[PDB]
Amino acid sequence: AGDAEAGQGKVAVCGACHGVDGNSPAPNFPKLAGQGERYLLKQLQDIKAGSTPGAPEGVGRKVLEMTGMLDPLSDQDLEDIAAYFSSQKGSVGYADPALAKQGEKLFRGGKLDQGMPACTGCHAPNGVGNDLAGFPKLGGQHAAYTAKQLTDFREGNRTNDGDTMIMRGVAAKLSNKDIEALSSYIQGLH
Numbered sequence: 128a129g130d131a132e133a134g135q136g137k138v139a140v141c142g143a144c145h146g147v148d149g150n151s152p153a154p155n156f157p158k159l160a161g162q163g164e165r166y167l168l169k170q171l172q173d174i175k176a177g178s179t180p181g182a183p184e185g186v187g188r189k190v191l192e193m194t195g196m197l198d199p200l201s202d203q204d205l206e207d208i209a210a211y212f213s214s215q216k217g218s219v220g221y222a223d224p225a226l227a228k229q230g231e232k233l234f235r236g237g238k239l240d241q242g243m244p245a246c247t248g249c250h251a252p253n254g255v256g257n258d259l260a261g262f263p264k265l266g267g268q269h270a271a272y273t274a275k276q277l278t279d280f281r282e283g284n285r286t287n288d289g290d291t292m293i294m295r296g297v298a299a300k301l302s303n304k305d306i307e308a309l310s311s312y313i314q315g316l317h
């Protein structure tokens with residue numbers, strides 16, 4: 128576990144994009160505020176490994192917008208940063224019913240015809256996740272971000288679910304329309 132107060136001092140470069148408290152309105156930059164600490168730590172570690180210049184291909188999580196950024200930070204610094212954002216208050220955004228009605232049916236019901244589970248079992252009915260398990264909070268996340276993650280899991284661009292193999296398999300059954308719908312619903316969910 129990290130020291131949130133210490134992490135508050137280690138995130139100046141992050142602020143422009145993620146916001147000082149981890150809530151920015153920038154739709155492609157994920158909100159970090161109130162995310163589970165274990166999840167954030169894993170992602171920081173994975174992003175650090177996959178985004179360093181010369182990283183071996185397919186390792187970790189390669190975030191182009193964060194190349195080299197986490198390189199000077201030690202493990203404990205990443206924990207402190209995770210603790211800092213997890214301690215912040217998340218926000219909720221807009222769920223357009225034209226999309227979010229179908230998004231809700233998918234989120235709660237899955238696509239059992241295609242063997243795809245509902246999302247609620249791991250990410251909770253209100254999208255708060257399960258951080259003791261490391262299942263991320265989704266509720267309130269920017270739709271464009273969420274949509275990109277589901278697309279990346281489906282297309283094999285995001286592969287840092289290897290410890291569980293879960294999201295690659297889930298996202299494989301989602302259409303572009305399904306992803307748009309889910310992401311809209313999730314943006315307003317709490």
Ligand code: HEC
Nearest residue numbers: 138140141144155156157167170171190192193196208275
């Ligand atoms: C804008 C140039 C950024 C700066 C500065 C930092 N981050 Fe970032 N972060 C950025 C993007 C575009 C993304 C998403 C990439 C993609 O998949 O589409 C990210 C992602 C993260 C995450 C993952 C969050 C999740 O929900 O899985 C984390 C934990 C993260 N960023 C942390 C982080 C920190 C601690 C930074 C300062 C050291 C930082 N980011 C800067 C864009 C930008």
Ligand code: HEC
Nearest residue numbers: 244245246249262263273276277287288291293294297309
């Ligand atoms: C448990 C069996 C799960 C089910 C069913 C679904 N998800 Fe999931 N999801 C799970 C884990 C273990 C992870 C973490 C992978 C990692 O990198 O450690 C996730 C992650 C996501 C994300 C990424 C969130 C982020 O902040 O980047 C998204 C957007 C997500 N999951 C969406 C999602 C949806 C919409 C699902 C139903 C169709 C769903 N997941 C099911 C575990 C599980």
